[PDB]
From a paper:
The recombinant subunit vaccines Bexsero and Trumenba contain an important meningococcal antigen, factor H binding protein ([name]), which is a lipoprotein composed of two β-barrels that tightly bind domains 6 and 7 of human complement factor H (CFH). [name] is antigenically variable; databases of genome sequences contain more than 900 different [name] peptides, which fall into three variant groups or two subfamilies: V1 (subfamily B), V2 and V3 (both subfamily A). Here we use structure-based design to generate chimeric antigens (ChAs) against serogroup B [name]. ChAs retain epitopes from both [name] and [name], and can elicit functional immune responses against both antigens.
All ChA scaffolds align with good agreement (route-mean-square deviations (RMSDs) range between 0.447 and 0.614) to [name] V1.1, demonstrating that the [name] scaffold is not perturbed by insertion of VR2 P1.16. In each structure VR2 P1.16 adopts a β-turn conformation that extends away from the [name] scaffold. In ChAs, the VR2 N- and C-termini are effectively locked into a 'biological' β-turn peptide mimic by neighbouring [name] β-strands, as confirmed by our atomic structures. We demonstrate that integration of a VR2 loop does not alter the overall architecture of [name] and that the VR2 loop folds into a conformation recognised by a bactericidal mAb. SBA titres were detected with antisera raised against fHbpV1.1:PorA294/P1.16 when alum was used as the adjuvant, and with antisera raised against fHbpV1.1:PorA151/P1.16 (a low level of SBA from a single mouse), or fHbpV1.1:PorA309/P1.16 when MPLA was the adjuvant.
Residue numbers in the entry: 78 to 181, 185 to 308, 308A, 308B, 308C, 308D, 308E, 308F, ...
Write the structure that this text describes.
């Protein structure tokens, strides 16, 4: 697939597959500039700009190089550097950022972080949900340095309650269970599910999924798993501090098309 450079250069096309535009909001805030570069050329994005996801492959992670910067007195200052990840589905898509370089004034230090960017798509109205039956969504859960997570979720529309499970991630602590939670309409009446995660029947963080698709075809959100990492003091004093591991979640129902299997 060589159309990943077309996502940064070619305009929006109505014939492109599935979700063709992603509004970059949380990925780049305020006056910041998010420069994406991959394959051939590059494109700079501002807050609210559109990402031409239509020319990216569905159900796969596209990887760009991102430089998050800001202008100070007419000159761009590199705030963050790393890899920008985009997972595209048919009615929803989400982005993630792997921090590789931060500031620490004029230089850049090497720090590795990972956060979830935007989670956008055709939000399903809570007032337009099915009434009865259980939908099975299967897809990907991807975290820092691991895109092979297998996400499985199921929603009961008669009880308005869904639950899930994450498997096959490299770190066995991240293979956590998505506890049962109710379907609730958010501020914009969109159908969202928020709950906790369970490892060995113990709370280890939270998770938030959004229902996307005109007929609730897909679910897309993120999970925050509670972990603990080491901090090396200025005198080599280790401290076991708590941290959060962010996991991108994106699943879809099994499709049945008119003219192909």
């Amino acid at each position: 697939g060589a159309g990943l450079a077309d996502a940064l250069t070619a305009p929006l096309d109505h014939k492109d597959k599935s979700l063709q535009s992603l509004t970059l909001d949380q990925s780049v805030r305020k006056n910041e500039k998010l420069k994406l570069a991959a394959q051939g050329a590059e494109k700079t994005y501002g807050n609210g700009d559109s990402l031409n996801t239509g020319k990216l492959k569905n159900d796969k992670v596209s990887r760009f190089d991102f430089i998050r910067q800001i202008e100070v007195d007419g000159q761009l200052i590199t705030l963050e550097s790393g890899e920008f990840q985009v997972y595209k589905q048919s009615h929803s898509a989400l982005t993630a950022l792997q921090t590789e370089q931060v500031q620490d004034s004029g230089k850049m230090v090497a720090k590795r972080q990972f956060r979830i960017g935007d989670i956008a798509g055709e939000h399903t109205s809570f007032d337009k949900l099915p009434e009865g039956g259980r939908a099975t969504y299967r897809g990907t859960a991807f975290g820092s340095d691991d895109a092979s997570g297998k996400l499985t979720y199921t929603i009961d529309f008669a009880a308005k309650q869904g639950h899930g499970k994450i498997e096959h991630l490299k770190s066995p602590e991240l293979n956590v269970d998505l506890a049962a939670s109710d379907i609730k309409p958010d501020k914009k009446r969109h159908a969202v599910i928020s709950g906790s995660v369970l490892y060995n029947q113990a709370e280890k963080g939270s998770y938030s999924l959004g229902i996307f698709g005109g007929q609730a075809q897909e679910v897309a959100g993120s999970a925050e798993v509670e972990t603990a990492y080491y901090t090396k003091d200025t005198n080599n004093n280790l401290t076991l501090v708590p941290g959060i591991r962010h996991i991108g979640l994106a699943a879809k129902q099994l499709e049945h098309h008119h003219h192909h299997h």
